[PDB]
Structure 1
Amino acid sequence: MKINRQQYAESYGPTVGDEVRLADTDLWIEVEKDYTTYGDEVNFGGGKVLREGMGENGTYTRTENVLDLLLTNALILDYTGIYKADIGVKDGYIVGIGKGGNPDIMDGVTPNMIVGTATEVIAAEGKIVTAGGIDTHVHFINPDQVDVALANGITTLFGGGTGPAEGSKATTVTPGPWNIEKMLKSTEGLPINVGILGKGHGSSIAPIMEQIDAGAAGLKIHEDWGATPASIDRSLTVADEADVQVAIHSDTLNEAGFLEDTLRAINGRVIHSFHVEGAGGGHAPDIMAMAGHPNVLPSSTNPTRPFTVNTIDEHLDMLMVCHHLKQNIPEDVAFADSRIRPETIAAEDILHDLGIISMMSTDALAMGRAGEMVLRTWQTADKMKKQRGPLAEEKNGSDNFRLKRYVSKYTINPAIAQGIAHEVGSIEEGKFADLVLWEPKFFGVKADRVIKGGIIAYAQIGDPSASIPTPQPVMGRRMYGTVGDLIHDTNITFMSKSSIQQGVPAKLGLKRRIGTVKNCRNIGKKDMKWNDVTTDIDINPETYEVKVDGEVLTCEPVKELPMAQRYFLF
């Protein structure tokens, strides 16, 4: 007995060789391999396979290779591959990627993926499953930002801030031991993973280091606090000792140096360069040349992504408003004209496509959109396909190489840069079960269900008074993972090794899972998955033209994007 492929995909989701359109883009992903045994697919419901004696084992206790949760028939899109599998979760972690069910009667069951009495089931057939997004450029300004992030599939927020204080409104910084302690305590109530950055500023080690010992998970060097050679140096000496990452928003004004001076102060040490294109800040006009260097882990923020016809008008005015500029102060219009450049924004699209900018991020509420990191990543990939063609590395008509290159920018790469990829950032065995299910029609736009630590935290679901959950109004809502003390077991607070060894969690009464930041100082550009290109980026000081390997990098702005007016109410 045979099933035609259209009917097969309708019932169980796609299989080897089938392609799926990403939302309303022109991007198609292709199933590379499938872990199932045709005819022994797992499925749940009235009269279906996962029933006692059948696809559900009736013999084994939970500890005997039985899962807490099985996601059936997922189409995984990850740096590791684009493929079809069941995902098994236990104790909050991904423990098996393969084929779930009962070894009594099915062939090919992965040995620790038994569906038993203890197992909950999520049907992922017809859904695309990705890792939760890792946003490493978050300003903690307004707690309403968390649901915004969750709704677009973000599960980890790394950054800083104390609320709507001017320091935090400008910089991803939670300054000093007391503010850090207070925000670790606030974090107990946020339904998302969090890591906190201290102020990467000072000329003595102690004032900087005491933040790391207090519970910070990294540092931020920002020009608003003085991105001088000294603060750069002292922060990287602390980071190399503490094994945490340093981010930088460099001196736009070139006050104490040009880009080469900041690179000299870095002295080959690893650093994460935020909004590397420079509209979001940094040495004018040539900060984007940071993305060519081996010791630099380069991210973009999202307002410039991708280059559209309203971008320049919007950014010139945004900068006037947020940086308080006056058109009647000649220095302020020169400053703006030196910072907001179509030449570097157009090239940024192409540097993403080439794998020279490795990461995406938001810059949430300071100069970036909390719920648009994932969104704008796929809009950029789609624009690049249209303008540059399918990459050369594509095969058999799919956009899989491009899709793996771009999914890495907001999942595994930020996690590696931050020293947290042992816990999150990808759909791999042994990693925390932060998983996002997407309907293909909404892929990258609005998440279906967001799983945090193995329990659904956020979902698009309807009328709570209805007979079934699908009637209107269907909207994003917090689920049982966010309620009561379950918010503690489903989320991770990432902290330095020294704060953990000094017993900060117990001191402050932290109940969240505590994650250790490690292995951040011996990495480089070569460790950024699918985005590991080092090259000499030349930015002309007069014209702002960007060249890589002797060629000018330019592309046009687009008038329309997918993942836009077809979906949003406003």
Structure 2
Amino acid sequence: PQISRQEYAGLFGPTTGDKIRLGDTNLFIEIEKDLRGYGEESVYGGGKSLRDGMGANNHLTRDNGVLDLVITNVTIVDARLGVIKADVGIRDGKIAGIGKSGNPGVMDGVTPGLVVGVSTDAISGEHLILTAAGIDTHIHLISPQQAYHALSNGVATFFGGGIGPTDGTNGTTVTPGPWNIRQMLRSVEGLPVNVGILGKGNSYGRGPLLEQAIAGVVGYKVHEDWGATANALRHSLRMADEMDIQVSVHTDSLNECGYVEDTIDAFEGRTIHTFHTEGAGGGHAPDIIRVASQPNVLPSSTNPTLPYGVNSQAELFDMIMVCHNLVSFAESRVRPETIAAENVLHDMGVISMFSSDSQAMGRVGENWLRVMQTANAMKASRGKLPEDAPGNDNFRVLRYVAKITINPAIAQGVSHVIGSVEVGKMADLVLWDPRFFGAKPKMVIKGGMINWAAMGDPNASLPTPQPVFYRPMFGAMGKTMQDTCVTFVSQAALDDGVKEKAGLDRQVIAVKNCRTISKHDLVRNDQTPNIEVDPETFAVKVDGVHATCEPIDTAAMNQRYFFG
């Protein structure tokens, strides 16, 4: 038979050629591909297709590869797969398939591995967007409660450091030394997010670095506050290459031991992650932004400058002046010209990642929000990216998504296990209502279980009655919370028995592929142009073109959606 699109959509959601508005933004995504045929559509319910002997197989044991979970008729927004409509399948807390789910007994075209059976539960994705969960590379471990704010914006992995609210943690992403590391590994067992910890890089010999490596860190953080010296850099990077771990940097803002060019030379063409690349959050003043030209630099921005708004200068000024309990350090630190420039460079694919800088100038619960907010402000000011397709904003959206998903993963050497909706990966997933995209998710799926969700009255006759607020779920409960969460570590540590030694019940996974990567390995954000900054007026030129845009008055996904 023949059915109208409108009727089809109502049953099954949007198909190839259909367009979806991402909130109250002016971004419109379009479905590129529909992997789940027509006429044999898998839906859970009374009188529906995923019933016994019909869409569901009723004779196969689980060891035949029957699924543990299926997400049906869902729109996948992923930086590597693009914008597709598919069934998604989970087995052993891993993504087994993307395609057409059902029962091959009674159905043509069931994707191998997507057999629904006796073992299978179901999620109805018809009117939903599925993303990879975000990854926040710049976490200060000041407060355990950050995790909750994060899960509530669709972030489920933390990279950083600290030891609670010490003055060192308030300023840097460091967990210093083997005692403190051990302690912190043990603590995070109580958190419903994945974690990897960073160590203190400012050391003269190998000894003090190696120490922390074996103790379990995934990285070394080089910070001004503890000394952002050439020495620090050099030894940190040399060790890193030895240990297959990452190095992150917060450069010398004062220009004490050098200018940016000297820092660059301290990198010695070695892979490095550069936090708040613009400089409002720290770095060689006015011109740390020039590191975004280099192939060995994996650049990030912290989220308080994105998007650039009318209140942005006022805020930042006042913030530093309290951050550093303080004026010529101030107005040199806080530069309208470079902030605008950061925005543009993002849109170009020259700054490759978003981050929070949690409770050290940024907002742990706003990375997915701000990303979307930025994409939309930038469409307005610049129009369509050249690579956009005329009818849709896919190219753009997808650039931005890479920023909080696959790119962070790649940077910290965990793209083998997390960061994209792809076969063989850990199911660290987020479900969104389009109406709420970026802002307010439906749920978080954390190791194949729902860990976090928007839930109303537990006494009510439905799950939807008011008050609806974010709450832990069963994956967040008991021994499952550890079972479903990863503690990232060094291979050195893994090999030394960190899991036993530290007594960790978390999944313990070795970071890998941190040192052979470059800017060009980054997804949709692989551009290395010439960047020039004017030491007087702080004006930024990118391949000779002035890089600016005007501040926004009104943000999307903002006062409409939030009481906060």
TM-score in terms of structure 1 length: 0.98
Task: Provide the rounded CA distance (Å) in 2 between the counterparts of 1:447 and 1:292.
Answer: 35
Deviation at residue 305 of structure 1 after TM alignment: 0.4
Tell me the SS of whatever aligns to 1:463.
Answer: coil
Residues 1:550 and 1:396: Cα distance change in structure 2 (over 3 Å): closer
Tell me the SS of whatever aligns to 1:303.
Answer: helix
- What does the per-residue CA deviation read over 1:224-246, in whole Å, with 9 as the maximum and x for residues that have no partner? 00000101111101100000110
Tell me the SS of whatever aligns to 2:130.
Answer: strand
Task: Provide the rounded CA distance (Å) in 2 between the counterparts of 1:63 and 1:254.
Answer: 62
The residue that corresponds to 1:89 in the other structure is 90
The residue that corresponds to 2:105 in the other structure is 104
Task: Provide the rounded CA distance (Å) in 1 between the counterparts of 2:531 and 2:343.
Answer: 14
The residue that corresponds to 1:270 in the other structure is 271
Structure 2 counterpart of 1:412, one-letter code:
I
- What does the per-residue CA deviation read over 1:13-54, in whole Å, with 9 as the maximum and x for residues that have no partner? 211000101111100000000111211111001111101110
Deviation at residue 461 of structure 1 after TM alignment: 1.2
Task: Provide the rounded CA distance (Å) in 2 between the counterparts of 1:256 and 1:90.
Answer: 53
Gaps of 5+ in 1: 326-332
- What does the per-residue CA deviation read over 1:466-520, in whole Å, with 9 as the maximum and x for residues that have no partner? 0111100011101000101001111110000000000011111101111110111
- What does the per-residue CA deviation read over 1:153-197, in whole Å, with 9 as the maximum and x for residues that have no partner? 001000001100111110011000000000000011100000000
Gaps of 5+ in 2: none
Task: Provide the rounded CA distance (Å) in 1 between the counterparts of 2:455 and 2:125.
Answer: 16
The residue that corresponds to 2:53 in the other structure is 53
The residue that corresponds to 1:168 in the other structure is 169
Conserved 8 A contact 1:37-1:107: no
Deviation at residue 65 of structure 1 after TM alignment: 2.1
- What does the per-residue CA deviation read over 1:400-456, in whole Å, with 9 as the maximum and x for residues that have no partner? 000111100000000000000000000000000001000001100011100000000
Return the match for 2:404 from 410, 416, 420.
410
Return the match for 1:438 from 432, 456, 470.
432
- What does the per-residue CA deviation read over 1:71-110, in whole Å, with 9 as the maximum and x for residues that have no partner? 1111000112111011101000111111111001112101
Task: Provide the rounded CA distance (Å) in 2 between the counterparts of 1:312 and 1:304.
Answer: 9
Q: Is 1:469 matched up with 2:469?
A: no
Task: Provide the rounded CA distance (Å) in 1 between the counterparts of 2:407 and 2:140.
Answer: 20
Alignment of 1:551-566 (within 5 A): 551-566=545-560
The residue that corresponds to 1:293 in the other structure is 294
Return the match for 1:423 from 397, 417, 422.
417
Task: Provide the rounded CA distance (Å) in 2 between the counterparts of 1:557 and 1:26.
Answer: 17
Q: Provide the aligned C-alpha RMSD in A.
A: 0.7
Alignment of 1:60-75 (within 5 A): 60-75=60-75
Structure 2 counterpart of 1:87, one-letter code:
V
The residue that corresponds to 1:259 in the other structure is 260
Task: Provide the rounded CA distance (Å) in 2 between the counterparts of 1:2 and 1:488.
Answer: 50
After the TM superposition, which parts of structure 1 deviate over 4 Å for at least 4 consecutive aligned residues? none
The residue that corresponds to 2:145 in the other structure is 144
Return the match for 1:448 from 442, 445, 453.
442
Return the match for 1:503 from 477, 482, 497.
497
Task: Provide the rounded CA distance (Å) in 2 between the counterparts of 1:395 and 1:198.
Answer: 44
The residue that corresponds to 2:18 in the other structure is 18
Task: Provide the rounded CA distance (Å) in 1 between the counterparts of 2:74 and 2:427.
Answer: 14
The residue that corresponds to 2:246 in the other structure is 245
- What does the per-residue CA deviation read over 1:523-567, in whole Å, with 9 as the maximum and x for residues that have no partner? 000001000001111011111000011111111001001010100
The residue that corresponds to 1:335 in the other structure is 329
Task: Provide the rounded CA distance (Å) in 2 between the counterparts of 1:166 and 1:101.
Answer: 56
Task: Provide the rounded CA distance (Å) in 2 between the counterparts of 1:181 and 1:286.
Answer: 37
The residue that corresponds to 1:328 in the other structure is none
The residue that corresponds to 1:204 in the other structure is 205
Which shifted more, 103-112 or 293-302? 103-112
The residue that corresponds to 1:568 in the other structure is 562
The residue that corresponds to 2:391 in the other structure is 397
The residue that corresponds to 2:232 in the other structure is 231
Q: Is 1:529 matched up with 2:561?
A: no
Tell me the SS of whatever aligns to 1:283.
Answer: coil
Deviation at residue 67 of structure 1 after TM alignment: 0.4
Task: Provide the rounded CA distance (Å) in 2 between the counterparts of 1:70 and 1:396.
Answer: 34
Tell me the SS of whatever aligns to 1:393.
Answer: coil
Structure 2 counterpart of 1:377, one-letter code:
V
Structure 2 counterpart of 1:494, one-letter code:
F
Structure 1 counterpart of 2:461, one-letter code:
S
The residue that corresponds to 2:124 in the other structure is 123
Q: Is 1:512 matched up with 2:513?
A: no
Task: Provide the rounded CA distance (Å) in 2 between the counterparts of 1:195 and 1:2.
Answer: 53
Task: Provide the rounded CA distance (Å) in 2 between the counterparts of 1:9 and 1:296.
Answer: 45
Which shifted more, 392-401 or 290-299? 392-401
Task: Provide the rounded CA distance (Å) in 1 between the counterparts of 2:520 and 2:434.
Answer: 32
Conserved 8 A contact 1:139-1:366: yes
Deviation at residue 7 of structure 1 after TM alignment: 2.1
Tell me the SS of whatever aligns to 1:471.
Answer: coil
Return the match for 2:541 from 535, 540, 547.
547
Task: Provide the rounded CA distance (Å) in 2 between the counterparts of 1:4 and 1:362.
Answer: 45
The residue that corresponds to 2:223 in the other structure is 222
Task: Provide the rounded CA distance (Å) in 2 between the counterparts of 1:538 and 1:344.
Answer: 11
Deviation at residue 208 of structure 1 after TM alignment: 1.5
Task: Provide the rounded CA distance (Å) in 1 between the counterparts of 2:7 and 2:251.
Answer: 55
Structure 2 counterpart of 1:163, one-letter code:
G
Structure 2 counterpart of 1:245, one-letter code:
Q
- What does the per-residue CA deviation read over 1:260-282, in whole Å, with 9 as the maximum and x for residues that have no partner? 11111111000000010110100
The residue that corresponds to 2:185 in the other structure is 184
Structure 1 counterpart of 2:306, one-letter code:
R
Q: Is 1:346 matched up with 2:340?
A: yes
Conserved 8 A contact 1:65-1:111: no
Task: Provide the rounded CA distance (Å) in 2 between the counterparts of 1:119 and 1:133.
Answer: 26
- What does the per-residue CA deviation read over 1:264-306, in whole Å, with 9 as the maximum and x for residues that have no partner? 1111000000010110100000001111110000011000001
Alignment of 1:302-317 (within 5 A): 302-317=303-318
Task: Provide the rounded CA distance (Å) in 1 between the counterparts of 2:346 and 2:6.
Answer: 35
Tell me the SS of whatever aligns to 2:328.
Answer: helix
- What does the per-residue CA deviation read over 1:298-349, in whole Å, with 9 as the maximum and x for residues that have no partner? 0110000010000000000011111111xxxxxxx00011111000000111
Deviation at residue 396 of structure 1 after TM alignment: 3.9
- What does the per-residue CA deviation read over 1:124-152, in whole Å, with 9 as the maximum and x for residues that have no partner? 11101000001000001111111000000
The residue that corresponds to 2:454 in the other structure is 460
Tell me the SS of whatever aligns to 1:561.
Answer: coil
Conserved 8 A contact 1:158-1:195: yes
Task: Provide the rounded CA distance (Å) in 2 between the counterparts of 1:93 and 1:379.
Answer: 31
Task: Provide the rounded CA distance (Å) in 2 between the counterparts of 1:53 and 1:192.
Answer: 38
Tell me the SS of whatever aligns to 1:519.
Answer: coil
Structure 1 counterpart of 2:276, one-letter code:
H
Q: How many residues get paired?
A: 563
Q: Is 1:381 matched up with 2:382?
A: no
Structure 2 counterpart of 1:39, one-letter code:
G
